[PDB]
Amino acid sequence: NVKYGIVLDAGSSHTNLYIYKWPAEKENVVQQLEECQVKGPGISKYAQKTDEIAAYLAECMKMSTERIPASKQHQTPVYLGATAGMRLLRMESKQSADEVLAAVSRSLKSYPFDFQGAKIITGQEEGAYGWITINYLLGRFKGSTFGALDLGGSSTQITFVPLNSTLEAPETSLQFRLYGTDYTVYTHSFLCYGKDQALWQKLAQDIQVSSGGILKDPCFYPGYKKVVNVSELYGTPCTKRFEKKLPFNQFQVQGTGDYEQCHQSILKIFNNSHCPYSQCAFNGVFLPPLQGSFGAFSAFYFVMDFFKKMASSQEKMTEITKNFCSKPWEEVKASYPTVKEKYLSEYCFSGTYILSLLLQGYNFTGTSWDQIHFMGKIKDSNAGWTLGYMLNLTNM
Amino acid sequence: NVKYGIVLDAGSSHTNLYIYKWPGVVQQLEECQVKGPGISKYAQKTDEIAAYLAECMKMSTERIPASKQHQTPVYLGATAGMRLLRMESKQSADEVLAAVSRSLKSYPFDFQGAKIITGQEEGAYGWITINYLLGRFKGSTFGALDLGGSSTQITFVPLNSTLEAPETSLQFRLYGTDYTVYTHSFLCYGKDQALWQKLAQDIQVSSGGILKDPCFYPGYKKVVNVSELYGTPCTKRFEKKLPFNQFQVQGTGDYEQCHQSILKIFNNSHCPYSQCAFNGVFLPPLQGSFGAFSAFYFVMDFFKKMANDSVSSQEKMTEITKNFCSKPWEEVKASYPTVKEKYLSEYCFSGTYILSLLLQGYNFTGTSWDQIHFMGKIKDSNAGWTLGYMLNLTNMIPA
Ligand SMILES: [Cl-]
Ligand SMILES: [Cl-]
Ligand SMILES: [Cl-]
Ligand SMILES: [Cl-]
Ligand SMILES: [Cl-]
Ligand SMILES: [Cl-]
Ligand SMILES: [Cl-]
Ligand SMILES: [Cl-]
Ligand SMILES: [Cl-]
Ligand SMILES: [Cl-]
Ligand code: NA
């Protein structure tokens, strides 16, 4: 009759559970049925308290047992795929990552579902699956495909079929089989270049021993203030190249709300000086010339949508972002009183970062800018990697 | 009683035909090396393919009894040379495969296909071969290190069966037991394509048609035609417009400048894993013993003959290469007058290259170096992928 699959997306920010449903397969489509966002941080934050993982995953796991008919449960696969937050934790300590993942398996296995495993998926998988999700939901697997742009807290992915495929960096190519049609995508995940790790890089780059424990920052609203722990700041492999001895344990970010100085400061965490290829993105990584249209999703959509709702070209988006950046923090909280301050306080930075990333990192300048479509859902399913992952895992 | 099978290994530098024979008990009966380059060099000369295969195939018709020829299967497995041609042109590659098939089909055996095998296949199968020959299949297994003209493979069973990159993993059952094997092929990092990458990286508009190169002996010259250099996908990333149609490499023989120049074709700056090989590719921690074969053996075998005929530490292997690299080209030819110049000319480069790939590439640093066994034959049969390929494509590997 109908079948069910559960995918946990363990990202650096949140874990999200997805329930998928599809007609029982017949010789004569998968859709998202329900989503749950686990309360709390990403699972790597449990590294020293894996005793709490089970409790952590319980509310959303219960949703799933309440939601899928009991008969149907034993035959429903459950998989957790973790992404860059967990790649970072593994770079830090293989053994912590493993203890996290083992605690997740023991938790999940304790449910009525068919445990298919808890893995840290690769950056190429993450990007390829995202491209699969969006082209599947756009009907493209029945011609040319849409490229895929994914932004999260800890990494960002770009995936697309390029005009001419090369040996230039064949660890950036992925070939796979989809409905008799075989595809070669370019795909790269830029670890540390998700929006949250990019901000840590920027703060570590810019903090001065000089400063009395203050960092004025043009990427935050005039009057915004936030205290940062230096041990948290340097607690990620992403800021290792910037570690300094600071004579303080903690510092206050003080916003100065200036978009073009923000833009300039962001560009400093990008390195454009070495490119052992025809052309590159940044940090000497190969990128072929852009080709076709793109779907941009996850944080790309949640951040751009917020600016669009304030208003749609590159010039127009730059202008809206510059104006918003310079609004004082009290005004911003008062104009958007329903928005969690943890997201609201970031929109100036994230918006300027997305613009820098797309326009300077990937060269979606001018004419190409219209080739990007920001997307949350297609036919009611989240754009993301999980859907494509479920199609694959479904042997589909 | 007695059965035969033939497998042609169409590699970038040579096609090698192998006859296997059997009632760990399958055995190489004979090998024939085909005179000429690899089959992809025939892209525009496909009518010549039949004449090219003639001598080795006439050999097999003479060797196998006619009583047994019709039931003897014959396979061509082509590797990274043809992967590169399929990239340049799928049309070319397929024309070569078609000319090869027509020709093999004309012989009195059981024709079973000519195809380009994958890098994983090539790896896994080399690992099968050495462990089947070693009888490690009756315990620990050996890792497999393969170098040819166009690619290089590393295959072994890691301590952790849960790999960080499972597109680098295969799981099978062989002779009662489960294995998870890590395997990876690095296209363009065979010894000949590495040389082209390096020369393409190093030639400058400034060069004025002369490239002084430390990886070649003082007094050595070699002419490189720019549109042939730039006719491999492996050099595309270094292409530049040059105001000369060719250039002359002039040897300066300095090992340590050779080494540095070599390091420059490998990208080692980002690694999202615990550890990588190079270019962001995951590599598990090395474990156990390794057999290093094909071009690893022929090059290293040359150098160990200067080392009291034993592979010494990396220190001494290095010292040996350093000294060898300085010898003028007339002296080196005078000292090894029985070695074909086309091999001898490449040894300083190839030895320096192999040391870098093993030590910095595959992280064989220090302690781990001594676990590499350079081998050509085990028990009279070549170490390579072709015996393993045969064992499976004749399904003679039991679960
Ligand atoms: Cl995480
Ligand atoms: Cl992320
Ligand atoms: Cl993060
Ligand atoms: Cl290109
Ligand atoms: Cl609001
Ligand atoms: Cl070839
Ligand atoms: Cl090869
Ligand atoms: Cl070659
Ligand atoms: Cl000389
Ligand atoms: Cl000699
Ligand atoms: Na390495």
PDB file of C-alpha atoms in Angstrom, chain A residues 98-288:
ATOM      1  CA  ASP A  98      32.693   7.625  17.303  1.00  0.00           C
ATOM      2  CA  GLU A  99      31.279   7.790  20.829  1.00  0.00           C
ATOM      3  CA  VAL A 100      28.646  10.270  19.577  1.00  0.00           C
ATOM      4  CA  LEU A 101      27.671   8.083  16.664  1.00  0.00           C
ATOM      5  CA  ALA A 102      27.527   4.911  18.807  1.00  0.00           C
ATOM      6  CA  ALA A 103      25.203   6.633  21.290  1.00  0.00           C
ATOM      7  CA  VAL A 104      22.943   7.639  18.332  1.00  0.00           C
ATOM      8  CA  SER A 105      22.851   4.075  17.026  1.00  0.00           C
ATOM      9  CA  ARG A 106      22.011   2.646  20.462  1.00  0.00           C
ATOM     10  CA  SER A 107      19.229   5.233  20.805  1.00  0.00           C
ATOM     11  CA  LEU A 108      17.804   4.675  17.368  1.00  0.00           C
ATOM     12  CA  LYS A 109      18.100   0.889  17.525  1.00  0.00           C
ATOM     13  CA  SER A 110      15.949   0.914  20.695  1.00  0.00           C
ATOM     14  CA  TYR A 111      12.995   2.022  18.517  1.00  0.00           C
ATOM     15  CA  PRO A 112      10.479  -0.131  16.531  1.00  0.00           C
ATOM     16  CA  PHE A 113      12.041   0.833  13.204  1.00  0.00           C
ATOM     17  CA  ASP A 114      14.592  -0.906  10.984  1.00  0.00           C
ATOM     18  CA  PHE A 115      17.923   0.800  11.934  1.00  0.00           C
ATOM     19  CA  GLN A 116      19.829   1.437   8.726  1.00  0.00           C
ATOM     20  CA  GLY A 117      22.707   3.228  10.459  1.00  0.00           C
ATOM     21  CA  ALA A 118      24.186   6.480  11.677  1.00  0.00           C
ATOM     22  CA  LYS A 119      27.057   7.805   9.566  1.00  0.00           C
ATOM     23  CA  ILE A 120      28.961  11.029   8.865  1.00  0.00           C
ATOM     24  CA  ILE A 121      28.146  11.483   5.148  1.00  0.00           C
ATOM     25  CA  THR A 122      30.876  12.888   2.917  1.00  0.00           C
ATOM     26  CA  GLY A 123      30.901  16.432   1.531  1.00  0.00           C
ATOM     27  CA  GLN A 124      30.463  15.106  -2.059  1.00  0.00           C
ATOM     28  CA  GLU A 125      27.530  12.899  -0.941  1.00  0.00           C
ATOM     29  CA  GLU A 126      25.948  15.824   0.822  1.00  0.00           C
ATOM     30  CA  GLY A 127      26.194  17.940  -2.266  1.00  0.00           C
ATOM     31  CA  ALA A 128      25.224  15.214  -4.784  1.00  0.00           C
ATOM     32  CA  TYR A 129      22.160  14.285  -2.746  1.00  0.00           C
ATOM     33  CA  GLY A 130      21.026  17.877  -2.586  1.00  0.00           C
ATOM     34  CA  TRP A 131      21.243  18.088  -6.392  1.00  0.00           C
ATOM     35  CA  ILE A 132      19.282  14.832  -6.595  1.00  0.00           C
ATOM     36  CA  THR A 133      16.531  16.221  -4.273  1.00  0.00           C
ATOM     37  CA  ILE A 134      16.043  19.420  -6.259  1.00  0.00           C
ATOM     38  CA  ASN A 135      16.194  17.887  -9.711  1.00  0.00           C
ATOM     39  CA  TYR A 136      13.955  15.061  -8.659  1.00  0.00           C
ATOM     40  CA  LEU A 137      11.330  17.516  -7.258  1.00  0.00           C
ATOM     41  CA  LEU A 138      11.675  19.797 -10.331  1.00  0.00           C
ATOM     42  CA  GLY A 139      10.834  16.820 -12.639  1.00  0.00           C
ATOM     43  CA  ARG A 140      14.225  17.065 -14.341  1.00  0.00           C
ATOM     44  CA  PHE A 141      14.890  13.294 -14.246  1.00  0.00           C
ATOM     45  CA  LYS A 142      12.536  12.991 -17.227  1.00  0.00           C
ATOM     46  CA  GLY A 143      17.395  17.568 -20.765  1.00  0.00           C
ATOM     47  CA  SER A 144      19.302  19.883 -18.519  1.00  0.00           C
ATOM     48  CA  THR A 145      19.512  20.027 -14.714  1.00  0.00           C
ATOM     49  CA  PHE A 146      19.621  22.675 -12.026  1.00  0.00           C
ATOM     50  CA  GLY A 147      22.788  23.246 -10.087  1.00  0.00           C
ATOM     51  CA  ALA A 148      22.495  23.096  -6.348  1.00  0.00           C
ATOM     52  CA  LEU A 149      23.774  25.594  -3.673  1.00  0.00           C
ATOM     53  CA  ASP A 150      23.543  24.529  -0.023  1.00  0.00           C
ATOM     54  CA  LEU A 151      24.549  26.645   2.933  1.00  0.00           C
ATOM     55  CA  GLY A 152      24.668  25.522   6.573  1.00  0.00           C
ATOM     56  CA  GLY A 153      26.435  26.480   9.748  1.00  0.00           C
ATOM     57  CA  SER A 154      29.682  24.607   9.156  1.00  0.00           C
ATOM     58  CA  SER A 155      30.040  24.103   5.362  1.00  0.00           C
ATOM     59  CA  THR A 156      28.711  25.118   1.938  1.00  0.00           C
ATOM     60  CA  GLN A 157      28.297  23.002  -1.178  1.00  0.00           C
ATOM     61  CA  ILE A 158      28.117  23.734  -4.871  1.00  0.00           C
ATOM     62  CA  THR A 159      27.055  20.915  -7.345  1.00  0.00           C
ATOM     63  CA  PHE A 160      26.254  21.216 -11.119  1.00  0.00           C
ATOM     64  CA  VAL A 161      26.791  19.446 -14.409  1.00  0.00           C
ATOM     65  CA  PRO A 162      29.437  21.609 -16.142  1.00  0.00           C
ATOM     66  CA  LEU A 163      29.634  22.431 -19.881  1.00  0.00           C
ATOM     67  CA  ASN A 164      32.768  20.323 -20.484  1.00  0.00           C
ATOM     68  CA  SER A 165      33.839  17.697 -17.908  1.00  0.00           C
ATOM     69  CA  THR A 166      37.576  17.558 -17.096  1.00  0.00           C
ATOM     70  CA  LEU A 167      40.397  15.722 -15.240  1.00  0.00           C
ATOM     71  CA  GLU A 168      41.247  19.047 -13.787  1.00  0.00           C
ATOM     72  CA  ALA A 169      40.376  17.985 -10.298  1.00  0.00           C
ATOM     73  CA  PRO A 170      38.773  14.526 -10.545  1.00  0.00           C
ATOM     74  CA  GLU A 171      38.232  14.391  -6.850  1.00  0.00           C
ATOM     75  CA  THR A 172      35.635  17.056  -7.620  1.00  0.00           C
ATOM     76  CA  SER A 173      33.657  14.832 -10.071  1.00  0.00           C
ATOM     77  CA  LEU A 174      30.970  12.329  -9.141  1.00  0.00           C
ATOM     78  CA  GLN A 175      29.255  10.000 -11.537  1.00  0.00           C
ATOM     79  CA  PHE A 176      26.085   8.013 -10.698  1.00  0.00           C
ATOM     80  CA  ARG A 177      23.085   6.349 -12.354  1.00  0.00           C
ATOM     81  CA  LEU A 178      19.625   7.825 -12.329  1.00  0.00           C
ATOM     82  CA  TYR A 179      16.895   6.215 -14.453  1.00  0.00           C
ATOM     83  CA  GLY A 180      19.234   4.805 -17.184  1.00  0.00           C
ATOM     84  CA  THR A 181      20.811   8.223 -17.456  1.00  0.00           C
ATOM     85  CA  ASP A 182      24.306   8.538 -16.054  1.00  0.00           C
ATOM     86  CA  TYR A 183      25.464  11.972 -14.700  1.00  0.00           C
ATOM     87  CA  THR A 184      28.805  13.619 -14.047  1.00  0.00           C
ATOM     88  CA  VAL A 185      28.544  16.436 -11.598  1.00  0.00           C
ATOM     89  CA  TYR A 186      31.168  18.804 -10.324  1.00  0.00           C
ATOM     90  CA  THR A 187      30.743  18.949  -6.583  1.00  0.00           C
ATOM     91  CA  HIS A 188      32.640  20.556  -3.768  1.00  0.00           C
ATOM     92  CA  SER A 189      31.965  21.151  -0.036  1.00  0.00           C
ATOM     93  CA  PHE A 190      33.880  23.998   1.465  1.00  0.00           C
ATOM     94  CA  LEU A 191      34.486  22.977   5.158  1.00  0.00           C
ATOM     95  CA  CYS A 192      34.571  26.049   7.518  1.00  0.00           C
ATOM     96  CA  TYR A 193      32.677  28.138   4.989  1.00  0.00           C
ATOM     97  CA  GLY A 194      29.190  27.637   6.310  1.00  0.00           C
ATOM     98  CA  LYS A 195      27.829  30.876   7.713  1.00  0.00           C
ATOM     99  CA  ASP A 196      28.590  30.221  11.386  1.00  0.00           C
ATOM    100  CA  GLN A 197      32.133  28.940  10.904  1.00  0.00           C
ATOM    101  CA  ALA A 198      32.777  31.828   8.544  1.00  0.00           C
ATOM    102  CA  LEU A 199      31.801  34.257  11.317  1.00  0.00           C
ATOM    103  CA  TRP A 200      34.195  32.484  13.756  1.00  0.00           C
ATOM    104  CA  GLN A 201      36.951  32.806  11.230  1.00  0.00           C
ATOM    105  CA  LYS A 202      36.188  36.525  10.835  1.00  0.00           C
ATOM    106  CA  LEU A 203      36.107  37.168  14.552  1.00  0.00           C
ATOM    107  CA  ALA A 204      39.362  35.248  15.138  1.00  0.00           C
ATOM    108  CA  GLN A 205      40.926  37.027  12.250  1.00  0.00           C
ATOM    109  CA  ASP A 206      39.978  40.466  13.495  1.00  0.00           C
ATOM    110  CA  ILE A 207      40.270  40.290  17.303  1.00  0.00           C
ATOM    111  CA  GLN A 208      43.170  42.419  18.598  1.00  0.00           C
ATOM    112  CA  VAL A 209      45.329  41.726  21.727  1.00  0.00           C
ATOM    113  CA  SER A 210      45.444  45.499  21.894  1.00  0.00           C
ATOM    114  CA  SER A 211      41.742  45.962  22.403  1.00  0.00           C
ATOM    115  CA  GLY A 212      40.782  45.744  25.947  1.00  0.00           C
ATOM    116  CA  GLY A 213      38.459  42.880  25.106  1.00  0.00           C
ATOM    117  CA  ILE A 214      36.319  44.831  22.586  1.00  0.00           C
ATOM    118  CA  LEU A 215      35.986  44.196  18.844  1.00  0.00           C
ATOM    119  CA  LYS A 216      34.118  46.758  16.863  1.00  0.00           C
ATOM    120  CA  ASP A 217      32.507  44.954  13.964  1.00  0.00           C
ATOM    121  CA  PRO A 218      30.784  46.446  10.879  1.00  0.00           C
ATOM    122  CA  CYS A 219      28.836  43.212  10.329  1.00  0.00           C
ATOM    123  CA  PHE A 220      26.522  43.864  13.278  1.00  0.00           C
ATOM    124  CA  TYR A 221      23.948  46.617  13.796  1.00  0.00           C
ATOM    125  CA  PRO A 222      24.879  49.864  15.460  1.00  0.00           C
ATOM    126  CA  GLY A 223      24.540  49.222  19.239  1.00  0.00           C
ATOM    127  CA  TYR A 224      24.576  45.445  18.997  1.00  0.00           C
ATOM    128  CA  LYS A 225      26.664  43.878  21.747  1.00  0.00           C
ATOM    129  CA  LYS A 226      27.622  40.259  22.336  1.00  0.00           C
ATOM    130  CA  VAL A 227      30.206  38.683  24.557  1.00  0.00           C
ATOM    131  CA  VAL A 228      32.353  35.896  22.980  1.00  0.00           C
ATOM    132  CA  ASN A 229      34.376  33.253  24.944  1.00  0.00           C
ATOM    133  CA  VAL A 230      37.888  32.915  23.499  1.00  0.00           C
ATOM    134  CA  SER A 231      37.873  29.236  24.308  1.00  0.00           C
ATOM    135  CA  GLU A 232      34.682  28.701  22.281  1.00  0.00           C
ATOM    136  CA  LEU A 233      36.162  30.804  19.484  1.00  0.00           C
ATOM    137  CA  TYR A 234      39.277  28.808  19.218  1.00  0.00           C
ATOM    138  CA  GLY A 235      37.409  25.476  19.927  1.00  0.00           C
ATOM    139  CA  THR A 236      36.861  24.778  16.248  1.00  0.00           C
ATOM    140  CA  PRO A 237      39.497  23.662  13.734  1.00  0.00           C
ATOM    141  CA  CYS A 238      38.234  26.531  11.469  1.00  0.00           C
ATOM    142  CA  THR A 239      39.961  29.252  13.507  1.00  0.00           C
ATOM    143  CA  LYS A 240      43.303  27.434  14.081  1.00  0.00           C
ATOM    144  CA  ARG A 241      45.186  29.476  11.500  1.00  0.00           C
ATOM    145  CA  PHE A 242      44.176  32.667  13.419  1.00  0.00           C
ATOM    146  CA  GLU A 243      45.010  31.645  17.055  1.00  0.00           C
ATOM    147  CA  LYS A 244      46.931  34.310  18.943  1.00  0.00           C
ATOM    148  CA  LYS A 245      47.656  34.724  22.600  1.00  0.00           C
ATOM    149  CA  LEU A 246      44.987  37.073  23.899  1.00  0.00           C
ATOM    150  CA  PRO A 247      45.352  38.582  27.365  1.00  0.00           C
ATOM    151  CA  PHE A 248      41.678  38.236  27.969  1.00  0.00           C
ATOM    152  CA  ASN A 249      39.403  35.143  28.141  1.00  0.00           C
ATOM    153  CA  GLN A 250      36.387  36.822  26.615  1.00  0.00           C
ATOM    154  CA  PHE A 251      35.556  39.838  24.455  1.00  0.00           C
ATOM    155  CA  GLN A 252      32.613  41.948  23.515  1.00  0.00           C
ATOM    156  CA  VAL A 253      31.553  42.310  19.790  1.00  0.00           C
ATOM    157  CA  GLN A 254      30.286  45.903  19.302  1.00  0.00           C
ATOM    158  CA  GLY A 255      28.346  46.468  16.078  1.00  0.00           C
ATOM    159  CA  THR A 256      29.020  49.423  13.837  1.00  0.00           C
ATOM    160  CA  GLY A 257      26.601  48.583  11.035  1.00  0.00           C
ATOM    161  CA  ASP A 258      28.543  49.289   7.837  1.00  0.00           C
ATOM    162  CA  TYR A 259      27.866  46.915   4.931  1.00  0.00           C
ATOM    163  CA  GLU A 260      30.801  47.790   2.712  1.00  0.00           C
ATOM    164  CA  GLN A 261      33.317  47.442   5.562  1.00  0.00           C
ATOM    165  CA  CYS A 262      31.537  44.234   6.416  1.00  0.00           C
ATOM    166  CA  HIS A 263      31.916  43.070   2.815  1.00  0.00           C
ATOM    167  CA  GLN A 264      35.607  43.936   2.837  1.00  0.00           C
ATOM    168  CA  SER A 265      36.236  42.102   6.121  1.00  0.00           C
ATOM    169  CA  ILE A 266      34.544  38.957   4.889  1.00  0.00           C
ATOM    170  CA  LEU A 267      36.655  38.849   1.783  1.00  0.00           C
ATOM    171  CA  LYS A 268      39.726  38.540   4.000  1.00  0.00           C
ATOM    172  CA  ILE A 269      38.898  35.000   5.031  1.00  0.00           C
ATOM    173  CA  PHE A 270      38.912  34.015   1.352  1.00  0.00           C
ATOM    174  CA  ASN A 271      42.282  33.300  -0.229  1.00  0.00           C
ATOM    175  CA  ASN A 272      42.451  34.072  -4.034  1.00  0.00           C
ATOM    176  CA  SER A 273      46.261  34.098  -4.500  1.00  0.00           C
ATOM    177  CA  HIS A 274      46.920  30.304  -5.376  1.00  0.00           C
ATOM    178  CA  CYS A 275      45.100  28.449  -8.138  1.00  0.00           C
ATOM    179  CA  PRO A 276      46.777  25.308  -9.562  1.00  0.00           C
ATOM    180  CA  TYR A 277      43.844  25.066 -12.118  1.00  0.00           C
ATOM    181  CA  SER A 278      42.405  26.932 -15.098  1.00  0.00           C
ATOM    182  CA  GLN A 279      40.202  28.863 -12.593  1.00  0.00           C
ATOM    183  CA  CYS A 280      39.128  28.447  -8.910  1.00  0.00           C
ATOM    184  CA  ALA A 281      36.492  29.348  -6.343  1.00  0.00           C
ATOM    185  CA  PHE A 282      38.682  30.321  -3.462  1.00  0.00           C
ATOM    186  CA  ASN A 283      41.446  28.695  -1.405  1.00  0.00           C
ATOM    187  CA  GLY A 284      42.924  27.108  -4.556  1.00  0.00           C
ATOM    188  CA  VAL A 285      39.914  24.950  -5.202  1.00  0.00           C
ATOM    189  CA  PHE A 286      38.983  24.159  -8.797  1.00  0.00           C
ATOM    190  CA  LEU A 287      35.623  25.436 -10.094  1.00  0.00           C
ATOM    191  CA  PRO A 288      34.482  24.988 -13.676  1.00  0.00           C
TER     192      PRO A 288
END
